[PDB]
Short mmCIF file of all heavy atoms in Angstrom, two decimals:
data_model
loop_
_atom_site.label_atom_id
_atom_site.label_comp_id
_atom_site.label_asym_id
_atom_site.label_seq_id
_atom_site.Cartn_x
_atom_site.Cartn_y
_atom_site.Cartn_z
N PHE A 100 117.44 64.36 -140.46
CA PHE A 100 118.58 63.58 -139.94
C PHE A 100 119.19 62.69 -141.02
O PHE A 100 118.53 62.30 -141.98
CB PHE A 100 118.12 62.75 -138.74
CG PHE A 100 117.80 63.59 -137.54
CD1 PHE A 100 116.58 64.22 -137.41
CD2 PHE A 100 118.74 63.78 -136.54
CE1 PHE A 100 116.29 65.02 -136.32
CE2 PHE A 100 118.45 64.58 -135.45
CZ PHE A 100 117.23 65.20 -135.33
N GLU A 101 120.45 62.31 -140.82
CA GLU A 101 121.24 61.59 -141.84
C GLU A 101 120.61 60.26 -142.24
O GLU A 101 120.90 59.77 -143.33
CB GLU A 101 122.68 61.40 -141.34
CG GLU A 101 122.81 60.57 -140.07
CD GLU A 101 124.23 60.23 -139.65
OE1 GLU A 101 124.96 61.13 -139.25
OE2 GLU A 101 124.58 59.02 -139.73
N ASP A 102 119.85 59.61 -141.34
CA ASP A 102 119.26 58.28 -141.59
C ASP A 102 117.80 58.40 -142.04
O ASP A 102 117.13 57.34 -142.13
CB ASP A 102 119.42 57.37 -140.37
CG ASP A 102 118.71 57.84 -139.12
OD1 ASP A 102 118.17 58.96 -139.11
OD2 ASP A 102 118.69 57.01 -138.15
N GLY A 103 117.33 59.62 -142.32
CA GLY A 103 115.98 59.86 -142.84
C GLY A 103 115.01 60.38 -141.81
O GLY A 103 113.94 60.85 -142.19
N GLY A 104 115.33 60.35 -140.53
CA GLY A 104 114.41 60.92 -139.54
C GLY A 104 114.04 62.34 -139.92
O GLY A 104 114.93 63.11 -140.36
N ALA A 105 112.78 62.70 -139.74
CA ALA A 105 112.27 64.04 -140.05
C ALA A 105 111.41 64.54 -138.90
O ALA A 105 110.60 63.78 -138.35
CB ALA A 105 111.46 63.97 -141.31
N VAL A 106 111.58 65.80 -138.54
CA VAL A 106 110.78 66.42 -137.45
C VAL A 106 110.31 67.79 -137.92
O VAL A 106 111.13 68.63 -138.34
CB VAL A 106 111.57 66.55 -136.14
CG1 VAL A 106 110.63 66.95 -135.02
CG2 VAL A 106 112.27 65.25 -135.76
N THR A 107 109.03 68.02 -137.77
CA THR A 107 108.46 69.37 -137.95
C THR A 107 107.97 69.86 -136.60
O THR A 107 107.37 69.11 -135.83
CB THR A 107 107.38 69.44 -139.03
OG1 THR A 107 106.87 70.78 -139.10
CG2 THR A 107 106.29 68.43 -138.76
N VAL A 108 108.31 71.09 -136.29
CA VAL A 108 108.03 71.69 -134.96
C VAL A 108 107.46 73.08 -135.18
O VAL A 108 108.02 73.84 -135.97
CB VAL A 108 109.29 71.74 -134.08
CG1 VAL A 108 108.96 72.16 -132.65
CG2 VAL A 108 110.06 70.44 -134.11
N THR A 109 106.41 73.44 -134.47
CA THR A 109 105.92 74.83 -134.44
C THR A 109 105.86 75.29 -133.00
O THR A 109 105.64 74.47 -132.08
CB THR A 109 104.58 74.97 -135.17
OG1 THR A 109 103.58 74.19 -134.52
CG2 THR A 109 104.74 74.57 -136.61
N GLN A 110 106.00 76.59 -132.81
CA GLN A 110 106.08 77.15 -131.46
C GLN A 110 105.40 78.51 -131.44
O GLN A 110 105.53 79.27 -132.40
CB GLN A 110 107.55 77.23 -131.03
CG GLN A 110 107.76 77.36 -129.54
CD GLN A 110 107.90 78.77 -129.01
OE1 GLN A 110 107.59 79.77 -129.67
NE2 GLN A 110 108.39 78.86 -127.77
N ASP A 111 104.74 78.81 -130.34
CA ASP A 111 104.20 80.15 -130.05
C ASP A 111 104.81 80.65 -128.75
O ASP A 111 104.79 79.91 -127.76
CB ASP A 111 102.69 80.13 -129.93
CG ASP A 111 102.12 81.52 -129.77
OD1 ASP A 111 101.85 82.12 -130.80
OD2 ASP A 111 101.99 81.99 -128.64
N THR A 112 105.32 81.88 -128.77
CA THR A 112 105.82 82.55 -127.58
C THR A 112 104.97 83.78 -127.30
O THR A 112 104.86 84.67 -128.16
CB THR A 112 107.29 82.93 -127.75
OG1 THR A 112 108.05 81.74 -127.94
CG2 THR A 112 107.82 83.69 -126.56
N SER A 113 104.45 83.85 -126.08
CA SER A 113 103.65 84.98 -125.59
C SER A 113 104.18 85.41 -124.22
O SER A 113 105.11 84.78 -123.71
CB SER A 113 102.19 84.63 -125.57
OG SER A 113 101.92 83.50 -124.75
N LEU A 114 103.58 86.44 -123.66
CA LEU A 114 103.95 86.98 -122.35
C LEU A 114 102.67 87.20 -121.56
O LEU A 114 101.76 87.87 -122.08
CB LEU A 114 104.72 88.29 -122.55
CG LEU A 114 105.24 88.98 -121.29
CD1 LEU A 114 106.33 88.16 -120.63
CD2 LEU A 114 105.76 90.36 -121.63
N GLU A 115 102.61 86.64 -120.36
CA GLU A 115 101.42 86.74 -119.48
C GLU A 115 101.89 87.14 -118.09
O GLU A 115 102.58 86.34 -117.46
CB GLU A 115 100.71 85.39 -119.39
CG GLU A 115 99.99 84.93 -120.64
CD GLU A 115 99.16 83.67 -120.39
OE1 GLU A 115 98.74 83.46 -119.21
OE2 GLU A 115 98.93 82.88 -121.35
N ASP A 116 101.55 88.35 -117.64
CA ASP A 116 101.81 88.78 -116.25
C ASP A 116 103.31 88.65 -115.95
O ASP A 116 103.69 88.21 -114.84
CB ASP A 116 100.95 87.95 -115.29
CG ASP A 116 99.45 88.12 -115.51
OD1 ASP A 116 99.01 89.27 -115.71
OD2 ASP A 116 98.74 87.09 -115.48
N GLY A 117 104.16 88.99 -116.92
CA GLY A 117 105.62 89.02 -116.73
C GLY A 117 106.33 87.68 -116.94
O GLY A 117 107.56 87.65 -116.78
N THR A 118 105.59 86.60 -117.22
CA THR A 118 106.16 85.25 -117.47
C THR A 118 106.01 84.93 -118.95
O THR A 118 104.92 85.11 -119.51
CB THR A 118 105.50 84.19 -116.59
OG1 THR A 118 105.73 84.56 -115.23
CG2 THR A 118 106.01 82.78 -116.85
N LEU A 119 107.07 84.41 -119.55
CA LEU A 119 107.04 83.97 -120.96
C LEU A 119 106.31 82.64 -121.02
O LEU A 119 106.51 81.79 -120.16
CB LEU A 119 108.46 83.86 -121.48
CG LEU A 119 109.19 85.19 -121.65
CD1 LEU A 119 110.69 84.97 -121.75
CD2 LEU A 119 108.68 85.93 -122.87
N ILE A 120 105.48 82.48 -122.03
CA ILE A 120 104.62 81.28 -122.20
C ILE A 120 104.96 80.67 -123.56
O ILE A 120 104.76 81.35 -124.59
CB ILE A 120 103.14 81.65 -122.12
CG1 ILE A 120 102.81 82.34 -120.78
CG2 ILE A 120 102.28 80.42 -122.36
CD1 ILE A 120 103.05 81.51 -119.53
N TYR A 121 105.39 79.42 -123.55
CA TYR A 121 105.80 78.69 -124.76
C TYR A 121 104.83 77.53 -125.00
O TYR A 121 104.60 76.72 -124.09
CB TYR A 121 107.21 78.11 -124.63
CG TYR A 121 108.33 79.06 -124.32
CD1 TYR A 121 109.53 78.56 -123.83
CD2 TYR A 121 108.24 80.44 -124.49
CE1 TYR A 121 110.59 79.38 -123.52
CE2 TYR A 121 109.30 81.27 -124.20
CZ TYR A 121 110.48 80.75 -123.71
OH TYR A 121 111.53 81.58 -123.42
N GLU A 122 104.31 77.42 -126.21
CA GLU A 122 103.48 76.26 -126.62
C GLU A 122 104.13 75.64 -127.85
O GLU A 122 104.34 76.35 -128.85
CB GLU A 122 102.04 76.70 -126.85
CG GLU A 122 101.07 75.56 -127.11
CD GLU A 122 100.80 74.64 -125.93
OE1 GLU A 122 100.72 75.14 -124.78
OE2 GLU A 122 100.67 73.43 -126.16
N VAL A 123 104.46 74.36 -127.77
CA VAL A 123 105.22 73.65 -128.84
C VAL A 123 104.39 72.49 -129.38
O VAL A 123 103.77 71.75 -128.57
CB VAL A 123 106.57 73.14 -128.30
CG1 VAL A 123 107.46 72.71 -129.46
CG2 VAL A 123 107.26 74.17 -127.43
N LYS A 124 104.42 72.29 -130.69
CA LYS A 124 103.81 71.11 -131.35
C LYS A 124 104.88 70.43 -132.18
O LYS A 124 105.57 71.12 -132.95
CB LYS A 124 102.65 71.55 -132.23
CG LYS A 124 101.55 72.29 -131.50
CD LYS A 124 100.42 72.68 -132.40
CE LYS A 124 99.41 73.56 -131.71
NZ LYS A 124 98.35 73.98 -132.67
N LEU A 125 105.05 69.13 -132.03
CA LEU A 125 106.15 68.39 -132.68
C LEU A 125 105.61 67.15 -133.35
O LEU A 125 104.79 66.43 -132.73
CB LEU A 125 107.21 68.06 -131.63
CG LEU A 125 108.42 67.29 -132.13
CD1 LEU A 125 109.67 67.72 -131.36
CD2 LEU A 125 108.23 65.78 -132.00
N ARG A 126 106.08 66.86 -134.55
CA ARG A 126 105.80 65.60 -135.25
C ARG A 126 107.08 65.05 -135.86
O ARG A 126 107.63 65.67 -136.79
CB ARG A 126 104.75 65.82 -136.32
CG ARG A 126 104.29 64.50 -136.91
CD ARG A 126 103.21 64.73 -137.95
NE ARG A 126 102.88 63.47 -138.56
CZ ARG A 126 101.84 63.28 -139.34
NH1 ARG A 126 101.04 64.30 -139.63
NH2 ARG A 126 101.61 62.07 -139.83
N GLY A 127 107.51 63.89 -135.37
CA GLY A 127 108.69 63.20 -135.92
C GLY A 127 108.27 61.93 -136.63
O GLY A 127 107.42 61.18 -136.10
N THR A 128 108.83 61.69 -137.79
CA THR A 128 108.51 60.51 -138.61
C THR A 128 109.77 59.94 -139.24
O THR A 128 110.78 60.61 -139.31
CB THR A 128 107.47 60.80 -139.71
OG1 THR A 128 108.05 61.72 -140.64
CG2 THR A 128 106.20 61.40 -139.15
N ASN A 129 109.68 58.73 -139.75
CA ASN A 129 110.72 58.13 -140.62
C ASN A 129 112.01 57.87 -139.84
O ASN A 129 113.06 57.70 -140.48
CB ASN A 129 110.98 58.96 -141.88
CG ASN A 129 109.79 58.97 -142.80
OD1 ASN A 129 109.65 58.05 -143.63
ND2 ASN A 129 108.98 60.00 -142.67
N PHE A 130 111.95 57.76 -138.53
CA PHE A 130 113.14 57.32 -137.77
C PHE A 130 113.25 55.80 -137.87
O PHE A 130 112.27 55.11 -137.61
CB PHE A 130 113.10 57.77 -136.31
CG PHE A 130 113.36 59.25 -136.17
CD1 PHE A 130 112.32 60.16 -136.21
CD2 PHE A 130 114.67 59.73 -136.06
CE1 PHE A 130 112.57 61.52 -136.12
CE2 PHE A 130 114.90 61.08 -135.98
CZ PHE A 130 113.85 61.98 -136.00
N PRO A 131 114.41 55.23 -138.26
CA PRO A 131 114.54 53.77 -138.25
C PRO A 131 114.21 53.26 -136.85
O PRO A 131 114.72 53.77 -135.86
CB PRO A 131 116.00 53.53 -138.64
CG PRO A 131 116.38 54.75 -139.43
CD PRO A 131 115.62 55.91 -138.79
N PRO A 132 113.33 52.26 -136.71
CA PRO A 132 113.00 51.78 -135.37
C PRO A 132 114.19 51.26 -134.55
O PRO A 132 114.12 51.20 -133.31
CB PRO A 132 111.97 50.69 -135.66
CG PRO A 132 111.30 51.20 -136.90
CD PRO A 132 112.44 51.70 -137.75
N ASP A 133 115.22 50.82 -135.25
CA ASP A 133 116.48 50.32 -134.62
C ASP A 133 117.61 51.34 -134.77
O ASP A 133 118.76 50.95 -134.60
CB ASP A 133 116.85 48.97 -135.23
CG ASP A 133 117.16 49.03 -136.71
OD1 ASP A 133 116.74 50.04 -137.36
OD2 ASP A 133 117.81 48.07 -137.22
#
């Protein structure tokens, strides 16, 4: 982001019994508190 915020995200997509299954991991850092 323009003010230095940074986010790393990983995702896994699978299929179980005809339903899509999403698992997400997110880490955001360096966002100005204000």
Side-chain angles (χ1 to χ4, degrees):
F100 291 82
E101 61 173 70
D102 63 353
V106 190
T107 179
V108 189
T109 63
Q110 199 266 15
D111 186 88
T112 299
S113 60
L114 182 67
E115 290 187 26
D116 299 317
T118 300
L119 291 162
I120 303 298
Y121 303 162
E122 187 68 38
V123 193
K124 302 181 187 177
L125 179 146
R126 189 178 175 169
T128 66
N129 293 275
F130 287 89
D133 63 341

